[model samples]
Target: ASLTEIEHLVQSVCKSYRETCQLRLEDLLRQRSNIFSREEVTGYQRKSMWEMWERCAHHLTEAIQYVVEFAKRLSGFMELCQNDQIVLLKAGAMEVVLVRMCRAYNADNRTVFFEGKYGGMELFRALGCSELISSIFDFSHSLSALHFSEDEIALYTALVLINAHRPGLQEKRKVEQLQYNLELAFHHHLCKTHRQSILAKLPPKGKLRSLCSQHVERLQIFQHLHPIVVQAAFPPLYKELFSGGGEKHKILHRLLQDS
Candidate 1:
């Protein structure tokens, strides 16, 4: 029964993943244009780096929304005390979003489909955060190469979210049980699919951790360059997640409360 429940959890997560990521790369690829090409036609060559960063923030916020919903729907997630719930989410949300980007990643072209276009790293070059963009593209390239089935991606996403050792957890035992369930479920799935090596193929957790920190570093740099834009242009949820201070738990608390 427990394992069956875990199966359903994965299925449910996949369903949500599909719905959130409804823009199929196959369909969008037909209409693909590189950022360089779009720039040629716009005649409006005056778009500043901050303007582009703001648009990317909008797309990033949309991805984070899906992650928040995915976390709330996770099995046994709410059973953890609210404090632990917030802690895990705070640490894991962007990491999961990075993983999810592979769903739209096109390996042959080395592009990611977002904001209704299949864009390459040039779309983000204006941010002057080439290191972070390169890292993300590399991560997406590797992840997309794995060709993970939807179910496996879902289970892996759940695994990312239910990390038992996330600092600030008050109910480590409960969180550990949840982590155990997903691990066993993932192992069973790999065995059943004869893709047992997939377990080893997953990127180390530290990789995601470092990528996320790099993202924050770039954001702060952007903020220094365009303080008013960050305050005015960023989505509320994104602002709270990456830049909020003093009382940092507001958006997540409301997200869980309403869910």
Candidate 2:
């Protein structure tokens, strides 16, 4: 496809993403009292932890769904062998979530807007994984500082999934061809809208890879710490994607079905 056609595809997916992830402030009053204190970090309140974990996981599941919808709409994505699609979803989904997380981040206050509230690191105290949470905020902070437009975010997300070297790609050559087209389109878009040095502002894939592993590690720890809460709080699709629990193939089956 021509670069112009590819640009149109990214724009279409970006529009779909905005429609799908609209934040509904009506769900709750803008309650901002949730942030806790340093003294509270040691106790790990089961009740608050459970509630926050549920809220975070639920939001995350929605983000994952958005990623899937974005993928299905991306040019040439659905044409890949189903196995490759699954592989890409399993490998790249979390990274895309991290990238999309920028939209909800408020760099000025360093708080993410979630579930009709805005809170900072203290909000995550009960979860007891401050390191991982901090990394997320850091990544989001740096990404926001770059001030990428929605189109740039959409293109980068497409690049994340279309990487040619993902493990167990049944059709590497095919993926490589698709990847080339995306790179060209991204480059063309960048030329038109941003300085070439802005490339330096993008997070390298290696950093995203490291963050994904850290996310899984923290998740496993959280699951071990409060297995019951994790079991109840996380959605089936989320458990399938991150923790390797839940009804495995069912979500994938549903995810792959035409929406």
Candidate 3:
């Protein structure tokens, strides 16, 4: 990874932490599971559904922490103007999250598994997911077909968060360059056998940019509806640091709560 002949800046964090934190991260990710085993949740009782949402919220929290770590460790992320750093995160967090959580998607059954329990069509429909469900299923099926490894997902999600196209971006070129460096590093393994690999069928060029374009609307709708979800979905510091301190946040929080 090059900074266009300046000091070679962007580099892979996986190797350095493979023995250290990355392994811990993998173990931590493996730990999220449904306390309730796989079964139909039966009819939607608002009381039971609220419990389900709290469980989902916990899942979102863990996933968001990992995503925050990914963004933190992503090469050159901190070097960008701090505000651009935030814009990039909010732009991509939910999409990256869906990718991270794709393992839970049961394409054959058309269900999402949480903590090993089925959050079937019924649970999501209650969550206002007429469209989110279908979009996530399509995405999960396509991504699952590719069979991404741990390192690949790390880079793909980094690609999701670090790009030139986000609105309110300050240093677009640098962000693009960082993304380019990450893509090159990620593709190095893909090129081991060159075009014979799945990279040919998968999006190795536009990467998740096109995928994000297709899924962004659903992500926004889901995000807007679930206050707990979007609270975690937004950059970890965005609300506290940017949204006019307490008054504005209270209003936003109340609005999301009402929705």
Candidate 4:
């Protein structure tokens, strides 16, 4: 099928999923509120707020999974058009749609998970983008091109350390550790007087602009830059994952020119 047709199909599926998610969320909220109004229940007989919270949490988790699956299917559609310029354009547009959908979901559900205004909401937003991008690169067979840079690696490492692991450290401790590692990586790689003289040499804003310009015209630039930046800015263990150094760099340069 043509890219347009595929996009339409994905859109239809996304619409259905979104509507269902909204309905589920509304139902969960209504049920939680209704449980509070049951006056016949004594203290011992009443369902605890924590119990209601768990049910709400479970439903939200399921909804998120559905949304993620929809995103995966959309990414699959984009993957099918990987070789076509028009298709990639369509894919990029579809990506924007998915971003917005995820953003809305995060906004609506923030109170359910987050503590402060920006608490868990921001994390979910980043996760949604990460999931979409990861799926696109993985399914499209383009991860080698969109390598993770040391900075990205460090960021992800910090995020993982903060967010991952069951029976993990306290959230406050995790957040502090993440913040500390992030600062360390930034100073080690991005700040002046660091070991990486080249990074210090480049003007920060100018370098950012240059990379953004390069990335806009060529998607592979993102593929290549992410790994190197992550590897160089992060730690040694990530080096192996970010290897393919010179060859991937060359491929990125070539692809950037061609694309």
Q: Highest lDDT, which number?
A: 1
What shift in Å separates residue 132 of candidate 1 from its native position after superposition? 0.5
TM-score of each: 0.89, 0.84, 0.65, 0.21
Q: What is the TM-score of candidate 4?
A: 0.21
Cα-based lDDT for every prediction: 0.78, 0.76, 0.55, 0.31
**lDDT (Cα, tens digit) per residue for candidate 1, span 186-215:** 777788789898767889888899898998
The residue pairs in collision within model 2 are none
Q: Tens digits of per-residue lDDT for model 2 on 1-259?
A: 7767767765665665565443432332243344334454333344466677777788888878878887887778899999899889888988888987787777777777654556677667777778888999999998988887766777778888898899999999999998888877777778877656678778777889878888788888878877987777678887888885554546876788767
Off by over 4 Å in 2: 1-47, 245-247
Of 2 and 4, the candidate ranking higher by TM-score: 2
Highest TM-score model number: 1
Better of 1 and 3 by lDDT: 1
Off by over 4 Å in 3: 1-40, 43-58, 193-197, 203-259
lDDT of 3 by residue, 12-44 (tens): 645422322222434434444442333445444
User: Candidate 3, TM-score vs. the true structure?
Assistant: 0.65
Q: How would you order the candidates by lDDT, starting with the best?
A: 1, 2, 3, 4
Cα miss at 63, model 4 (Å)? Answer: 1.8
The residue-by-residue lDDT of candidate 4 on 111-229, one tens digit each, is 22222122222232322234333333232222122232333322222222222122322343433543444334444443432335443332233332333233233323333545444
Give the clashing pairs for model 1: none
Answer with 2 or 4, whichever has the higher lDDT. 2
Lowest lDDT 10-residue stretch of candidate 2: 24-33
Q: How good is model 1 by TM-score? A: 0.89
